[PDB]
Ligand binder design. Structure first.
Ligand SMILES: OC[C@H]1O[C@H](O[C@H]2[C@H](O)[C@@H](O)[C@@H](O)O[C@@H]2CO)[C@H](O)[C@@H](O)[C@@H]1O
Ligand SMILES: OC[C@H]1OC[C@H](O)[C@@H](O)[C@@H]1O
Ligand SMILES: OC[C@H]1OC[C@H](O)[C@@H](O)[C@@H]1O
Ligand SMILES: OC[C@H]1OC[C@H](O)[C@@H](O)[C@@H]1O
Ligand SMILES: [Mg+2]
Ligand SMILES: [Mg+2]
Ligand SMILES: [Mg+2]
Length: 365
């Protein structure tokens, strides 16, 4: 009691957040400690269920329905004046069983990131990437590398031709799942065909793809706003644009709302509210995080007005509008674990595309 412990993922601007924490302490005398444990989103329910854990947890909103269902989050209590400072759809992302159970911070979607000096006119279709790769391979380069280990990054292609997670009835139907329909299989088959053709490698992960793109070894990558800061520091002149289409249809990234939840076991709920409402969710607080690692579009209208001019943010929102907001229901983690296994198994040859996605469908439903 008398201090704040915050958990945030290691790809986010945790040093910038710590600067907001230092300002909070200067003003209040209350110490703010920012940590970025690994697997924090799996650890939180295990420690919060014993009355331990951080005061504030940051993640995309998809995890938070499961937390709320288990009673691990405090209902947040912003007055109507504060609610009107943030975009309504961001509050919708953090509403569960009619209650607000987090503060929305930022809106994330994946984009195509391209080296302007290797591909001045980036490909508009996935289908043209193999021919581009062939020309780059004679120069000792590759067309594209992105994280193939996490389903977040492959989902936009799987969804393009008709894949979906849970069907929404204007409630989600947790038994109407679109992981093994024909559209999902078509997109995952194309990924596997690129791997078979040696346009990509099944073992590429986040670090490998980031290093290759930021050293000028691959012409394109797929990543979110948090990655831009490291590219700024690199030698690469990059642009951010629409994901390629597949079978003429847009890639459909899942849209995540970075959210801050208050632990139901926290003895510091009033302090957490003060920190989040009056320090973090200000133009200056978000600026401090954003200059560390970019947040994307932000939930705070006044600061989003200042970011909306950036072509990178425009591209982020263009991809977001072609995609879908993630569900926040508890079943979302089952979806992600099952799809992760399916993609890895298909890409490594441990299962056919059809067998992998059928097994995932069975697991989720
Ligand atoms: O891959 C499954 C994973 O997807 C999402 O995680 C994203 C996250 O939203 C981004 O902010 C960034 O950290 O990349 C992650 C993928 O590595 C879901 O939010 C998450 O629950 C899910 O595990
Ligand atoms: O178990 C698969 C994945 O699920 C949760 C962890 O965040 C990631 O470290 C783990 O790989
Ligand atoms: O369950 C262990 C999992 O956790 C972290 C890794 O990202 C994943 O490769 C591994 O399979
Ligand atoms: O891809 C596996 C990942 O999918 C979603 C989960 O939130 C995270 O724990 C899980 O790691
Ligand atoms: Mg983690
Ligand atoms: Mg609650
Ligand atoms: Mg792996």
């Amino acid at each position: 009691e008398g201090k704040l412990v915050i958990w945030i993922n290691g790809d986010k601007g945790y040093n910038g957040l710590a600067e907001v924490g230092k300002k909070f302490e200067q003003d209040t005398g209350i110490k703010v400690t920012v940590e970025h444990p690994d697997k924090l989103e799996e650890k939180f329910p295990q420690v919060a269920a014993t009355g331990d854990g951080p005061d504030i947890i940051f993640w995309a909103h998809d995890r938070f329905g499961g937390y709320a269902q288990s009673g691990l989050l405090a209902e947040v209590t912003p007055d109507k004046a504060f609610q009107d400072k943030l975009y309504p759809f961001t509050w919708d992302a953090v509403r569960y069983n009619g209650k607000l159970i987090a503060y929305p911070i930022a809106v994330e979607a994946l984009s195509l990131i391209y080296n302007k000096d290797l591909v001045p006119n980036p490909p508009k279709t996935w289908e043209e990437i193999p021919a581009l790769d062939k020309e780059l391979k004679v120069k000792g380069k590759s067309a594209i590398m992105f994280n193939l280990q996490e389903p977040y990054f492959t989902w936009p292609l799987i969804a393009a031709d008709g894949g979906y997670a849970f069907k929404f009835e204007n409630k989600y139907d947790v038994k109407d799942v679109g992981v093994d329909n024909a559209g999902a299989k078509a997109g995952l088959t194309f990924l596997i065909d690129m791997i078979k053709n040696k346009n990509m490698s099944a073992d590429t992960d986040y670090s490998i793809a980031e290093a290759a793109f930021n050293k000028g070894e691959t012409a394109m990558t797929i990543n979110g706003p948090w990655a831009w800061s490291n590219i700024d520091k690199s030698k690469v002149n990059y642009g951010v644009t629409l994901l390629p289409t597949f079978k003429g249809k847009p890639s459909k990234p899942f849209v995540g709302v970075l959210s801050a939840g208050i632990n139901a076991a926290s003895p510091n709920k009033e302090l957490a509210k003060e920190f989040l409402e009056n320090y973090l969710l200000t133009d200056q607080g978000l600026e401090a995080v954003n200059k560390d690692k970019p947040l994307g579009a932000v939930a705070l209208k006044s600061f989003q007005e200042q970011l909306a001019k950036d072509p990178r943010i425009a591209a982020t929102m263009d991809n977001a509008q072609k995609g879908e907001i993630m569900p926040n229901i508890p079943q979302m983690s089952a979806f992600w674990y099952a799809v992760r296994t399916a993609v890895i198994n298909a890409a490594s040859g441990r299962q056919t595309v059809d067998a992998a996605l059928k097994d995932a469908q069975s697991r989720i439903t």
